[PDB]
Write a protein that binds this ligand. Structure first.
Ligand code: 1N7
Ligand code: 1N7
Ligand code: MG
Ligand code: ZN
Ligand code: ZN
Lengths: 1337, 470
């Protein structure tokens, strides 16, 4: 019926055409029979009838008289639902300005009229006069005069001078303004003048005025003359039960406005004095402003008793506004909720449902079935039978609920798996049963949790719920390609107990012909559950081309494992059930069985595993007792030794040998060592405490303790819990944040005292508060992340691009924390891979790297494969399937139409509640260096004169195992390609002071320095070395500020020493506080010391700042372009950074603070994007200097490092999608041929397509620079104003929309949800495509 | 100090305090100035004969049983009034019959008219009739000046000299054309409009019975008097704004805003100024307080409630509340509504109705504790909707009655559909149906009774019988 929405500002004529009448009286009802009064806020003749086809006076009360208006009262005879869409108007007696356009964050009227907001408010407040059309009176067009000045001007001239005051004057000025003349004058000023601020202001003014001219709005329409009235029903006056009434605040605001307008009309008729007229006008302005937006201009008007009134803007805005509370989410029918239970007998695709809940839900279906079967003659009879609950309604319900799925949802929906579909099973009771396997996905427990039930209604909804939301259809997590239905506690414990051999048991060394007779021997009581026996087994292998090959052999296994072999599907080797079978082993087995067989065997195997684990756990019957906590016999001795050491340290402190801080450090270190010793001793005593003897002397095996098994099967508990149960719990933390020097020496088995309990209460309360706040922060972060990438949908199949992202393993200077298999599996390669030896062609370019390809790459030991990404996709308004890769929730490739942005945001935001000098080589390798300007010194060490040198360790496979940053002028023992051994020091340096060594040899002479002017003469008291300390600019005098100490190496002939390979002299201008090691008259050598210059938040605010693109507090200065450096003259500051290129000009200059240390020397050539200072790096500068790849790599690396430190595994595809969404806007440098401004900021896709069209034609394209914005800024800057208004700043968004006259095409998901139609993401993608292809055919 | 504030109360206080209050001598002087201006206006309006003409016409209408004597004269400065009106009529007729004595007899008639205390509405009618006639005269004069000064481009000073005083003849008609200038002899086309304007002026002068300059003199004299009276009244209002505020201070918590109360007090003060008399010797504050408090109380009783309540019922409620409070204070605790009838004079049901009158309505957005941040408006359901079960029962009944009516004969179905409002916009009466079918009313009745009997016969309409839920 429609395809777009248009927003603008309403003219008085249009407002009058909207109105069905005028409202002249504030009367509501007649307090007797509650009839609607005439010409009131609920006037029947204006707003339609009250009852259906009933006249107000009663004359006409039948449908026969529909359409004719009464003559006694005028009330039209029609439906009463027209009272909900009919509006009135009020004729104001004086013009009133609009509060939104006056008090919006940018003063629209103020900057349109080039008048200050303060002055405009002064004129509106009836304080000062304003001149309009001054003429030849020597008065400006916007000059403001006081009362005395206006009187003086009127006395001199009675004509050719017009002055008004207030909204009338503002409207007159707006009408008199000439938009075209203002545009041409501002363009001429832009062309003539040259200033940054003036240019920006004139550009904003020209843009606003050009958009106003393009739109059909008029400047004078911003001042309200006729205002609309809300329909009665939207502000009801219904009688409350008990003879009382309920009313909204809009009725009172309208009453106030009407009464003040009537008073103003009366005063104007009665020729009231000017002061009274002005007071009444001010009251009317205030009343209209408070009606439109209460509390914006001044103090809010209080309501009936205490609370302030609610305005239309208040209803529109807020979390409880229409957009968020009643339009984005809405209460729905056919819903139910109750408490959940386990019901372990259920299958994965079914759940339990109470009979009463299903009878109440499927009432229309039962009615229809009863009518169709002929049991009930009428729907009323069917309802009576259902109320009576006969014996046939239950059969009808069983028939209808046989194959009708339902929806189960938990109140926190963190990710996609918060809502699933199941197949109902009628049960007796009032509690829902939920499958244990989906409990981890649902994040639900059984301590009073509740869940909601939703019934799909239509055929399409039922089929969608069966094919997409079914529990068996989603077993893999969308965040990471891992199973999500793995057993947690009871099944894991049962399988661990089953598959756990013993040294000596019943029937040891028995030869078994099959697991069948193994279970025989188990059940019959003639053999133990776990005894070492020989069993003949047959296994099947898929080595053939889809066929299975059977092989039979004798294996060494146990009875438990042989019995468990029955449920394994006939596709897996026997080695996957011949271990302890913990939780990780169970998950790996499930994943292997999935990836090898398919889906149905996976779910069947999972159900069989859960059944067997439950049964065998119940058969074992493990318990917990007070004797399970075994106390070591050395705890007291260790405590005594620790106390003796503490006493000795206290005596030493009392002797004055050590300070308080050193004493505290020693005490805490001793206590930590004692705690570690106690924990290690108790681990050793508990882990192998079970000792037995088989047919001989004695032997030791793993312990049989119940708590040890519980902690070693990964079901529950951990090392920290065991330490807190059977040993001291360590050091606590005072409320200040430090650590108390006295630890807690008592465990939970023994009795803690009041002091230790009171100490632990602090940590318990801190933990509870942190847990309370983490959820509140994560909700906001998740909402902000979802709202920025909700419009991203896969729309193409292959964009045909050649770009990609270079993927390498993560090395931090030690052990690899991210193998290359994880970062490459599931991605498509951007370029064809070659052989490791660069001899033959490897896997082709456009292949999908599955597990087989990954295994082949691992076997071949490929160093680094490059892959495509979504940030380099060429698809406009979406991404292609090939660039995205594959959906890491199903085995196949990503389908077309999927709204990947929502999945990415949900996966990123779900684990948010979980978040709070000498190089020593590790392993043998070959020393490798990259970008090193090394030279041989006089001692043989390979000194390095480059600040971009990375130390790398390459093994004989050709893989990188180590990565270190080498400081400048560092001593290196080895070289490049020299074989070394593990644990060998190769590099040494002084971190407390960087060297100023030179790369050339010769003489050092003293030129351009005077003792006292720039240097001081100081003698060391201890060492006695004579050195000349260089004073900085502030320490020295003003005369010597232009004479920097210049040290230059000269040879024996007196000339400057030429650097090998070049001829530029190497002179170094020492900065302040530069201690010179050697004086004049002593020859030096290359690589020798000459001068010495002295030199992380937790949680996820780092993640929040990274996603919001917040600039660092102390950004690192970077080099704009490559070239030499030419220090600048102090200009009320430290230095001027001027970089001279090889041949280009050097207009660039920077303001360097004097409190920041600098690294570059006088004659050092810098590169583009190279660092000049030290500190946090700014992402905007990173982008501007190194493209988009560097900044997306930096963001991905930072977020992955934070999540890995927190222990959460998330794929980087989501991060990449978020970065792409954040990298959507771009500014214009200069327009080649297409109309564009020099600083306008538009969408990147628009300029891209415009440039493609220009290049296809004979014209010349333009140039642009990519811009980086935060998530909220990108969400606010959206082509569709509806989505922007739904998120935040509704008043500002609506004001800007109205002013610009913007047109909104739906073209999205949130807009289609708001309007109430099919979204173009799932099944509606094809409908939307068909609609687009039909339109403009 | 022109700004740095947002509340209009401060700005109103500043504007009010910019002026200084009066004293007894200043009040006497302003009253004397008002009296002088009123006397000048009265003389100016009595000096015209059309006032006497309207007086005689109104008296004749009163005597013709078309009005009353109440709105004729506001007392005197009723046989005496009748004889004075007869004397005035005789004076007017001798004035119209004495066209050099006309001026003196008009002056005497004006004096006798001023000796009569007429009605303010009559005086306003005389004033606006004078305004209408002078507006017509000035419109004719501006047309005259536009036809030659702004059309013939004839000289300013010459126009003034030859137009000041005559305003009736062709002094400005032929001179502006036949003065041998190149731009003078080109508007004989508008000479016709000049003649038409002259004829209009002559007709107006004949209707008025007097000259034009005297009319203009009276007009600007009464304008000066009105301006003086307005200035004096404005001074009085600006002086007594302080008293208005002081009186309005005490009603600030009765459901009305302070600014509204002070505006109503200002209106009441203006009304009191319009009727103040200084000859009694009392100060102005005593007379103004009654009017100000009456206006404030009337405004409070009128526009301080969502549902309007009449003034008499508001007074009854206030009296009941005052009694109840007095009886509670005297006796010790809350009394009973039955016992209030003994103290007052009521039939014991009016008090019950007054008590049963609903108080101010509860706000829709009021909160109830936390309630997951929900207000009172989230728990009110619409009662005007029909159930889907009811709609389906209605559809089923319509289908069943259609099926039952298909079985009957075509004529029976047609006559039934005509008698009852079935499948048509409206039903038809038995007589119109008989007329349409060319069948007598009694035969139609008998056929309807046979149809009803056949429908009451069993083995049919079983679902219709089942359509009862009792
Ligand atoms: C649910 C809520 C209590 C919540 C709580 O604190 N627990 C109670 C407290 C006050 C109750 C309303 C009022 O009586 C007025 C009115 C009476 C009508 O007859 C029925 C509707 C109304 C709106 C009532 C609904 C409901 O009954 C309310 C909201
Ligand atoms: C003060 C209290 C809220 C307390 C809170 O949680 N904060 C609210 C919640 C429910 C409200 C009553 C009901 O509506 C029924 C009834 C309606 C009449 O019209 C006026 C009287 C009654 C008794 C109301 C009074 C008052 O308004 C109540 C007690
Ligand atoms: Mg729980
Ligand atoms: Zn009517
Ligand atoms: Zn692509």
């Amino acid at each position: 019926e429609f395809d777009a929405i248009k927003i603008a500002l309403a003219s008085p004529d249009m407002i009058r055409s909207w109105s069905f009448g005028e409202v002249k009286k504030p009367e509501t009802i007649n307090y007797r029979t509650f009839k609607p009064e005439r010409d009131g806020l609920f006037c029947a003749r204006i707003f339609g009838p009250v009852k259906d086809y009933e006249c107000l006076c009663g004359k006409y009360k039948r449908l026969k008289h529909r359409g004719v208006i009464c003559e006694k009262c005028g009330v039209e005879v029609t439906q009463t639902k027209v009272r909900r869409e009919r509006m009135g108007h009020i004729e104001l007696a004086s013009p009133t300005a609009h509060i939104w356009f006056l008090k919006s964050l940018p003063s629209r009227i103020g900057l349109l009229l080039d008048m200050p907001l303060r002055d405009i408010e002064r004129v509106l407040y009836f304080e000062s006069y304003v001149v309009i059309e001054g003429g030849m009176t020597n008065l400006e067009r916007q000059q403001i005069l006081t009362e005395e000045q206006y009187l003086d001007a009127l006395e001199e001239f009675g004509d050719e001078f017009d002055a008004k005051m207030g909204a009338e004057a503002i409207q007159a000025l707006l009408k008199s303004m000439d938009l075209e003349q203002e545009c041409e004058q501002l363009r001429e000023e832009l062309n003539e003048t040259n200033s940054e601020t003036k240019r920006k202001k004139l550009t904003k003014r020209i843009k606003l005025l050009e958009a106003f001219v393009q739109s059909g709005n008029k400047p004078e329409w911003m001042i309200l003359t006729v205002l609309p009235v809300l329909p009665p029903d939207l502000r009801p006056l219904v009688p409350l039960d008990g003879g009382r009434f309920a009313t909204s605040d809009l009725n009172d605001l309208y009453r106030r406005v009407i009464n003040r307008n009537n008073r103003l009309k009366r005063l104007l008729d009665l020729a009231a004095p000017d002061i009274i007229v002005r007071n009444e006008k001010r009251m009317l302005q205030e009343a209209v402003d408070a009606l439109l937006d209460n509390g914006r201009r001044g103090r809010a008007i209080t309501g009936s008793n205490k609370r302030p009134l609610k305005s239309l803007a208040d209803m529109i805005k807020g979390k409880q506004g229409r957009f968020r509370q009643n339009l984005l989410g809405k209460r729905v029918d056919y819903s139910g909720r109750s408490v959940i239970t386990v019901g372990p007998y259920l299958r994965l695709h079914q759940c339990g449902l109470p009979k009463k809940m299903a009878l109440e839900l499927f009432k229309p279906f039962i009615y229809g079935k009863l009518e169709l079967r002929g049991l009930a003659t009428t729907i009323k009879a069917a309802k009576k039978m259902v109320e009576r609950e006969e014996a046939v309604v239950w059969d009808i319900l069983d028939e209808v609920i046989r194959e009708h799925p339902v929806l189960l949802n938990r109140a926190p929906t963190l990710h996609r798996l918060g809502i699933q579909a199941f197949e109902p099973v009628l049960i007796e009771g009032k509690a829902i049963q939920l499958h244990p396997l989906v409990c981890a996905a649902y994040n639900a427990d059984f301590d009073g949790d509740q869940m909601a039930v939703h019934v799909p209604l239509t055929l399409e909804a039922q089929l969608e719920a069966r094919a997409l939301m079914m529990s068996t259809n989603n077993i893999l997590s969308p965040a990471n390609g891992e199973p999500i239905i793995v057993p947690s506690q009871d099944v894991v414990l049962g399988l661990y107990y089953m598959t756990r051999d013993c040294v000596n048991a019943k029937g040891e060394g028995m030869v078994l012909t099959g697991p069948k007779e193994a279970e025989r021997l188990y059940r019959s009581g003639l053999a133990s559950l776990h005894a070492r026996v020989k069993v003949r087994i047959t296994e099947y292998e898929k080595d053939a081309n889809g066929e299975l090959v059977a092989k039979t052999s004798l294996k060494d296994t146990t009875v438990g494992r042989a019995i468990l072999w029955m449920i394994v599907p006939k596709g897996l080797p026997y080695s996957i059930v011949n271990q302890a079978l913990g939780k990780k082993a169970i998950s790996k087995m499930l994943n292997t069985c999935y990836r090898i067989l398919g889906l149905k065997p996976t779910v069947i195997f999972a159900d069989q595993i859960m059944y067997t684990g439950f049964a065998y756990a119940a058969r074992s019957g493990a318990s917990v007792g007070i004797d399970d906590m075994v106390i070591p016999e050395k705890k007291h001795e260790i405590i005594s030794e620790a106390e003796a050491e503490v006493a000795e340290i206290q005596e030493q402190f009392q002797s004055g040998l050590v300070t308080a801080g050193e004493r505290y450090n020693k005490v805490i270190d001793i206590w930590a060592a004692a705690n570690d010793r106690v924990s290690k001793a108790m681990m050793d005593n508990l882990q192998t405490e079970t000792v037995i003897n088989r047919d001989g002397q004695e032997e030791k095996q793993v312990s049989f303790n119940s708590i040890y098994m519980m902690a070693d099967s990964g079901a529950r508990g951990s090392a920290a819990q065991i330490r807190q149960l059977a040993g001291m719990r360590g050091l606590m933390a005072k409320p200040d944040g430090s650590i108390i020097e006295t630890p807690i020496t008592a465990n939970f088995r023994e009795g803690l005292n009041v002091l230790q309990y009171f100490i632990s209460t602090h940590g318990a309360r801190k933990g509870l508060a942190d847990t309370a706040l983490k959820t509140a922060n994560s909700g906001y972060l998740t909402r902000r992340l979802v709202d920025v990438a909700q419009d991203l949908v896969v729309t193409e199949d292959d964009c045909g691009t050649h770009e990609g992202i270079m993927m390498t393993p993560v090395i931090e200077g030690g052990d690899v924390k991210e193998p290359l298999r994880d970062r490459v599996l599931g991605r498509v390669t951007a370029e064809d891979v070659l052989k490791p030896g660069t001899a033959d062609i490897l896997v082709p370019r456009n292949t999908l790297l599955h597990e087989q390809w990954c295994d082949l790459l691992e076997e071949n030991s490929v160093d680094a494969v490059k892959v495509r990404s979504v940030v380099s996709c060429d698809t406009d308004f979406g991404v292609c399937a090939h660039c995205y890769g594959r959906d890491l929730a199903r085995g196949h490739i990503i389908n077309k139409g999927e709204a990947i942005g929502v999945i990415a945001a949900q996966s990123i935001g779900e684990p948010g509640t979980q978040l709070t000098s000498s190089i020593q080589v590790k392993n043998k390798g070959s020393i490798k260096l990259s970008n090193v300007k090394s030279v041989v010194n006089s001692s043989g060490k390979l000194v390095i004169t480059s600040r971009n040198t990375e130390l790398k360790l390459i093994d004989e496979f050709g893989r990188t195992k180590e990565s270190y940053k080498v400081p400048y002028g560092a001593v290196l023992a080895k070289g490049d390609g020299e074989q070394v051994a593990g644990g060998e020091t190769v590099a040494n340096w002084d971190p407390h002071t960087m060297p100023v060594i030179t790369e050339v040899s010769g003489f050092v002479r003293f030129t351009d320095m005077i003792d006292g002017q720039t240097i001081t003469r100081q003698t060391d008291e201890l060492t006695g070395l004579s050195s000349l300390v260089v004073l900085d600019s502030a320490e020295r005098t003003a005369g010597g500020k232009d004479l920097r100490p210049a040290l230059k190496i000269v040879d024996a002939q007196g000339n400057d020493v030429l650097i090998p390979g070049t001829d530029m002299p190497a002179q170094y201008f020492l900065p302040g506080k530069a201690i010179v090691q050697l004086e004049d008259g002593v020859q030096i050598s290359s690589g020798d010391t000459l001068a010495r210059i002295p030199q992380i938040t937790g949680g996820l605010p780092r993640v929040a700042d990274l996603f919001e693109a917040r600039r660092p507090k102390e950004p690192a200065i970077l080099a704009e372009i490559s070239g030499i450096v030419s220090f600048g003259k102090e200009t009320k500051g430290k230095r001027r950074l001027v970089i001279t290129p090889v041949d280009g000009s050097d207009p660039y200059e920077e303001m360097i603070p004097k409190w920041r240390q600098l690294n570059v020397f006088e004659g050092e050539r810098v590169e583009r994007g190279d660092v000049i200072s030290d500190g946090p790096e700014a992402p905007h500068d990173i982008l501007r200097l190194r493209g988009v790849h560097a900044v997306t790599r930096y963001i991905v690396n930072e977020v992955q490092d934070v999540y890995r430190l927190q222990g959460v595994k998330i794929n980087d595809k989501h991060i990449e999608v978020i970065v792409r969404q954040m990298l959507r806007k771009a500014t214009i440098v200069n327009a080649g041929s297409s109309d564009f401004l020099e600083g306008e900021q538009v969408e990147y896709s628009r300029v891209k397509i415009a440039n493609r069209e220009l290049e296809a034609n004979g014209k010349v394209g333009a140039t642009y620079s990519r811009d980086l914005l935060g998530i909220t800024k990108a969400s606010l800057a959206t082509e569709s104003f509806i989505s922007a208004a739904s998120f935040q700043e509704t008043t500002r968004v609506l004001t800007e929309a109205a002013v610009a006259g913007k047109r909104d095409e739906l073209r999205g998901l949130k807009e289609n949800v708001i309007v109430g139609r099919l979204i173009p993401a799932g099944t509606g993608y094809a409908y939307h495509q068909d609609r687009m292809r039909r339109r403009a055919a | 100090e022109i700004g740095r504030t947002t509340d209009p109360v401060r700005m109103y206080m500043r504007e009010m305090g910019t002026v200084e209050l009066l004293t007894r001598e200043g009040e006497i002087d302003i009253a004397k100035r008002i009296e002088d201006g009123i006397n000048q206006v009265q003389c100016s309006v009595a000096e015209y004969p059309e006032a006497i003409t309207y007086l005689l016409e109104q008296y004749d209408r009163v005597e013709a049983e078309e009005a009353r004597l109440s709105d004729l004269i506001t007392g005197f400065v009723p046989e005496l009034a009748r004889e004075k009106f007869a004397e005035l009529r005789a004076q007017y007729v001798v004035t119209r019959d004495t066209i050099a004595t006309a001026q003196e007899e008009i002056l005497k008639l004006s004096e006798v008219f001023k000796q009569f205390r007429l009605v303010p509405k009559q005086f306003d009618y005389l004033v606006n009739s004078m305004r209408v006639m002078m507006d017509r005269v000035r419109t004719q004069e501006r047309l005259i000046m536009k036809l030659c000064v702004e059309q013939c481009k004839m000289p300013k000073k010459n126009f003034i000299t030859l137009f000041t005083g005559n305003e009736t003849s062709d002094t400005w008609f032929n001179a502006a054309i036949a003065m041998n200038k190149p731009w003078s002899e080109k508007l004989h086309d508008v000479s016709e409009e000049v003649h038409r304007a002259l004829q209009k002026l002559q007709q107006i002068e004949e209707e008025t019975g007097l000259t034009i300059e005297q009319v203009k003199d009276i007009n600007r004299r009464m304008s000066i008097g009105e301006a003086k009276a307005r200035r004096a009244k404005k001074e009085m209002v600006e002086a007594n704004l302080r008293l208005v505020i002081s009186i309005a201070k005490k009603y600030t918590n009765r459901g009305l805003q302070f600014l509204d109360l002070i505006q109503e007090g200002n209106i009441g003060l203006m009304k009191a100024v319009d009727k103040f008399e200084y000859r009694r010797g009392y100060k102005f504050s005593t007379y103004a307080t009654w009017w100000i408090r009456q206006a404030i109380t009337r405004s409070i009783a009128d526009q301080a409630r969502t549902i309007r309540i009449p003034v008499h019922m508001i007074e009854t409620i206030n009296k009941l509340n005052r009694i109840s409070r007095q009886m509670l204070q005297e006796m010790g605790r809350e009394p009973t509504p039955e016992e209030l009838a003994e103290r007052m004079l009521m039939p014991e049901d009016k008090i019950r109705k007054v008590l049963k009158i609903a108080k101010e309505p509860i706000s829709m957005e009021t909160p109830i504790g936390d309630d997951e941040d929900s207000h009172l408006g989230d728990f009110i359901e619409d009662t005007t909707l029909e159930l889907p079960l009811d709609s389906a029962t209605t559809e089923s009944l319509r289908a069943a009655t259609h099926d039952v009516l298909a079985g009957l004969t075509a004529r029976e179905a047609k006559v039934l559909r005509m008698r009852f409002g079935i499948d048509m916009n409206t039903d038809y009466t038995l007589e119109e149906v008989g007329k349409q079918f060319d069948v007598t009313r009694e035969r139609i009745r008998q056929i309807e009774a046979k149809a009803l009997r056949k429908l009451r016969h069993p083995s049919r309409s079983e679902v219709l019988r089942s359509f009862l839920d009792d």
